[PDB]
Symmetry: D3
Subunit: 143 residues, 6 copies
């Protein structure tokens, strides 16, 4: 069962929406990294999250295993952001995002190992400032 005070999803979201909180999360054993990326190319959003996650040590820079888990978690988060077609520029739209990646065990059982959450918050709209509205996305996966 999920540990009520270790909900990796809720935690990554609250962090993202509240502009410290990182040090507290880290003290509790979480691996954390925040970042911002904007683009009309989805691969760039994927790249920033991966680069930030590897440089901040949220995931191993070596091997495929952890990169694979993060890729699919990012994909799941992109579903919430794109809602239907995981396309930006080709569909005449752009995104301005802030992201958070959290890694750790959210379950009561230590045997559940580590899991990872990718959360995205920002705006999506036509490529013209103001013609936009909010967008959110959260992907969760086992590492």
């Amino acid at each position: 069962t999920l540990h009520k005070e270790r909900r990796i999803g809720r935690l990554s979201v609250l962090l993202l929406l509240n502009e410290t909180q990182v040090e507290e999360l880290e003290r509790d054993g979480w691996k954390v990294c925040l970042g911002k990326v904007g683009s009309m190319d989805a691969h760039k959003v994927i790249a920033a999250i991966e680069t930030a996650s590897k440089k901040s040590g949220v995931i191993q820079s070596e091997g495929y295993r952890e990169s694979h888990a993060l890729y699919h978690a990012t994909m799941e988060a992109l579903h919430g952001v794109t809602r239907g077609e995981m396309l930006l520029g080709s569909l005449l739209r752009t995104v301005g995002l802030r992201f958070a990646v959290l890694r750790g065990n959210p379950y009561e059982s230590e045997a559940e190992g580590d899991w990872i959450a990718v959360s995205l918050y920002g705006t999506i709209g036509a490529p013209i400032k103001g013609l936009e509205h909010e967008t959110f996305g959260v992907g969760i996966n086992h590492i």
Copy 2:
């Protein structure tokens, strides 16, 4: 452009993850609605959000216009929750959700009229307590 203090998406999410914070939102002019629904049938989730939204007065009980806006906002939020196949029971999975619906103008220009946000947060997993992880979804639409 979006009004920094009126980000309907962010506000509906913060509320969902928390006192009558509703009182404050309502005092500021927002039409608010909170509820909970769990099921293996997506139509039941859609129904609870609609019913609760009409009963609380977040949208007009009469006409199609506002129901239509809410339905699509709900569909968009369901993308973040299902991430790929907007299916539950048929894919051997169930969802336990808490939801919020916020209606109002989030832009600086009052000419933008009302918009509506549907936020979902809970767990999704196999039909067995514990075999689950968090799920999240936000849909925004003009109304």
Copy 3:
């Protein structure tokens, strides 16, 4: 290249939105079929088009080949009607349709053989009279 006077897609649509215009189409060599179906189950819509198509002789009642072509043509038309999730009842929505199936060669070269078009037109909406709007779909396939 497509024969200007034999645009199967356009012709099946015009027929659907209208005298036995069938007589004229049939005199020109087209195998035509018209019908109506309403439901909250997509499989019932697929079944009516198939049954009506076989009974009217638009496709062979024996073998798989022609049934296969029609099934995919129907799937393609269903995309225009559902626009995203080929789901009805499970997404708390219902459809009221009128359909047409036209079979024949729409190209200048007679070597292109027969092709089939499935056209759908009606309304889609919540399970409540009036809370609905139009829906449309066309699928084309070789047969």
Copy 4:
């Protein structure tokens, strides 16, 4: 309920398939605009429809609200045209389209306000003349 002689969907389609009809629609209070666009890039089809709709006055050129409604209506129409993957060039295919955008109240109740329909008709196929077949798409949304 939908007004039988004000079916915005059927009307936009009939207009598109019949090469005047505009003046009659306009006299009845409809905001109308016709256009043609061909491309291997979906954003270009979206751009043409938006530009034509704004220049002809079918939607306000200012604000996001109406642009937002038109964007989603165009997206819905693209589902019928692409059927599965809202991709053209990346999937080695191209489209040659004619489009119509109609705006007005199709319901018996004046309270339903304005709605908008985006209709597309043309051909889709490999990037080689003749290797193609028809394609249709209709998206309907509230403004």
Copy 5:
């Protein structure tokens, strides 16, 4: 990099299309599972693969972690089988499948840990013997 003699995907497929080749795979350290399932309900296919996988010991019966990895691997394999809409009965089609689940490390580095492959092969078609053709799907995931 992937170990030429340990390509889990290829191996699970070859097995599915064939003596206890299981014995050889097991001797090499692979956890293997073979089974068959037919249905018009995708959840029944997912259930048989899971049950058979846990009973045979391919994945842990306890905890969520490994069930989670298998569920997604199964979802991915279902994409190849359904190709578009992960639906069966609701789309008037049925499936007759044979499946294999292979677990182990397919990379040269032992640090990559275990991965899991789900392979499906059988027929898909209308609910009528003979009106069908082959279907195939492979899903791979870290575990």
Copy 6:
């Protein structure tokens, strides 16, 4: 019913996974062609398969009919390879594939005419050698 020793799907797969077999297939009346393509652009994978199929005579180089059947078969195979989003480069991923196209009648009834199968096998992953795993895809269609 499908002829047990003429299963076009299984046959194309076995050929693809076993590095002759072509001459034997050809002697039995099958039209066959093997090839390899790698890219971050899906249209290139589609192009190689089409070019190889036409040059090797698996399908007529003239007319649309057979090109149309092959296009959709390739699309169906790509579902198994991409599983969700038929995108490569835009989603920061690349594929290294080997492909086989088989054409002939797999049914007991000669009246079923010719059918075609497109099979893909290789690896998919981030654009960095080693950070990848296997991927399969099979599409079947009537010609």
